[PDB]
From Swiss-Prot:
The keyword Lipoprotein applies. It is found in: Cell outer membrane. This is Outer surface 22 kDa lipoprotein. It is a lipid-anchor. Keywords: Cell outer membrane, Lipoprotein, Membrane, Palmitate, Signal. The lineage of its organism: Bacteria, Pseudomonadati, Spirochaetota, Spirochaetia, Spirochaetales. It comes from Borreliella burgdorferi (strain ATCC 35210 / DSM 4680 / CIP 102532 / B31).
Amino acid sequence: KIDEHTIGHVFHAMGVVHSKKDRKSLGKNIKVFYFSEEDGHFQTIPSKENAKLIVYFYDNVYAGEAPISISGKEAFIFVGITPDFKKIINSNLHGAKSDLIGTFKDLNIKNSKLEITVDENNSDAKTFLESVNYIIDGVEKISPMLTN
Ligand SMILES: [Zn+2]
């Protein structure tokens, strides 16, 4: 299953306007898929441990999660994706803290690539753009399993 803490990350990424009272009840309807990644290929695995990509699906919207390194710390990034692969919705972090989540929201995706220029000297901004593009690529690749 998904713990309530993780549901809050997923629903935030997806822009699911909800009350905390309903979070666990609504969250039972989230579909979750875990993937290894080997040279661009995402294979289903049974649980989140060792996962390189986690894809959530709820009320016709996607969110992807991936491990990320943010100023030297191991963390996870979540990002919501519209099911036409044209926009991201919201991003958030577990395990680190960055103002960049205010940048990486409501952006266009053009053929699997975010429409944004980042400061090339900011390791965290490069990491966010790299991670979000990696996630969009993965979610598009496995989408035939969901809403194609
Ligand atoms: Zn968290």
